[PDB]
Design a protein around this ligand. Structure first.
Ligand SMILES: [Mg+2]
Length: 95
């Protein structure tokens, strides 16, 4: 029902339900070279129904697109997809 972050084979896998279908979709990311912007672009490419997507800190401050996925996953964040906000809780990993 929500957005999960699970490490598989050493890499974070973010799983989400996208608005156009029920089938959940997963996004494996490279912490040290992918950015927030890359992930958001992948989401948009996956579902044309997505009009708006953005990531925010738990305090509701927008997270810069250039920020590395490793940094994003140091703490909780919010992922907004159209009119829904997901509270995402990554497992804490040093770095
Ligand atoms: Mg915190």
């Amino acid at each position: 029902d929500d957005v999960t972050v699970v490490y598989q084979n050493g890499l974070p896998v973010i799983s989400v339900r996208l608005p156009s279908r029920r089938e959940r979709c997963q996004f494996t990311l490279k912490p040290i070279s992918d950015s927030v912007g890359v992930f958001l672009r992948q989401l948009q490419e996956e579902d044309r129904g997505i009009d708006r997507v953005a990531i925010y800190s738990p305090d509701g401050v927008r997270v810069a697109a250039s920020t590395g996925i490793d940094l994003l996953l140091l703490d909780d964040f919010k992922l907004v997809i159209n009119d829904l906000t997901y509270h995402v809780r990554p497992p804490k990993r040093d770095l």
